[PDB]
Design a protein around this ligand. Structure first.
Ligand code: GSH
Ligand code: GSH
Lengths: 237, 237
């Protein structure tokens, strides 16, 4: 059922009322953001994984850009860009907010995201390293970004980036830290103690824990993906 | 009074109650976003222009990144990143909202901004053109981005990107269109009729009209700026 839909597949039917659909990919960190928010808020939904290495033409009808995540509701409304989909889920569904109601406090989570916005691009450049030298230079680049984040916690003195309770901002940046390990880039959070504790507190989170992927699974996915295999997204099936 | 503060200047005192301060630069399009929102919502504020070519060390205490815009309120709270400052102003101050209350409708303005996010970087690359050839190639790049925007209006069939009434999203992208002219890049909106009408409807806006800068002024600023003159930001004084 978790199997992806690729070229030649038939476009899905309408989203049933009382449920929201997310076009995803099991190993995509941007879509994990959305899925983490979906679990945290206990929102009923269905998932359609997209074969990003061999995607269905009808998908661009879902997102002009052709990327995941993408949400589709019963009214047929489509929303793309992970952060937008997340902010949307927090506003449109019941439950405790993941984002503060307070303007300044909310703007802070936004500024922290800006602070981290460089990591996803670094992770891409990293996964493409070749020798110990490229590697060393990549570790220093991640190192500079990790300090920007440690200062926030340093200043705040709270467990999570938005307070003592986990919130939107934590879920938004977590996926990339989740892969830190499998990517052999942990000796980058050594000089950043609090950030390292944060990673430990996050893994203890029920929502985070329920969606956490195995290193062997991500390792298998990356092998195929880096090879451009139309089977990558379905690693493990 | 509009004169900028540069290296050696003294850090400003507290922001008086009932007023919000914006660290700006008269020719910065990102800060114009904030200033447009400030005018539209009729928010009392003071402006401190920053000499970006020769900025005061104390400013990094305002924004770690060292860029404008940046808002500072009486409680001493600092908020950076133009879009964040704008969203903040809409939520924290009285008046008609510039952003919709409806989650999906709000997410749409956000998706349109994503759609335009490539322009600011193109404008930078453009202002750095040298010959008619670079120029021609730049016109085609802007051309592709303008169509993405014309389709939205095409689909919506409304005057402005968020409806028949101007709203947040219009103000967010306007500054770059404002400079289109002075940058000799108008023959890019020819193949995009509706977008061209939008530009005309925007210039008719009282808020937009009150903050619109002269072509000769921006031309003068750019001459100095491109030269890295510590006087650029103060062109005209
Ligand atoms: S993780 C898989 C890719 N998704 C994104 O890059 C999402 C980026 C957006 N800016 C966001 O949602 O935040 C993806 O769909 N790749 C397909 C491709 O061909 O690029
Ligand atoms: S327009 C002058 C520059 N501002 C920005 O680039 C703001 C970019 C942010 N992403 C935003 O507010 O949206 C600026 O301050 N330049 C100074 C410099 O030295 O770069």
């Amino acid at each position: 059922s978790a199997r992806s839909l690729g070229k030649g597949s038939a476009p899905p039917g309408p989203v049933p009322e009382g449920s929201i659909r997310i076009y995803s990919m099991r190993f995509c960190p941007f879509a994990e953001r959305t899925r983490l928010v979906l679990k945290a808020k206990g929102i009923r939904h269905e998932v359609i994984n997209i074969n990003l290495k061999n995607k269905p033409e009808w998908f661009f009808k879902k997102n002009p850009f052709g990327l995941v995540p993408v949400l589709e509701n019963s009214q047929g409304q489509l929303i793309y860009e992970s952060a937008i989909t997340c902010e949307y889920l927090d506003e449109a569904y019941p439950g405790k907010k993941l984002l503060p109601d307070d303007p300044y406090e909310k703007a802070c989570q936004k500024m922290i995201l800006e602070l981290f916005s460089k990591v996803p691009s670094l992770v891409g450049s990293f996964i493409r390293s070749q020798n110990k030298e490229d590697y060393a230079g990549l570790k220093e680049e991640f190192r500079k970004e990790f300090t920007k984040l440690e200062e926030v916690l340093t200043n705040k003195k709270t467990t999570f980036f938005g307070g003592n309770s986990i919130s939107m901002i934590d879920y938004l940046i977590w996926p990339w830290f989740e892969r830190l390990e499998a990517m052999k880039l942990n000796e980058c959070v050594d000089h950043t103690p609090k950030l390292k504790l944060w990673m430990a507190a996050m893994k203890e989170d029920p929502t985070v824990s329920a969606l956490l992927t195995s290193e062997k699974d991500w390792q298998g996915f990356l092998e195929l993906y880096l090879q451009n295999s139309p089977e990558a997204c379905d690693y493990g099936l």
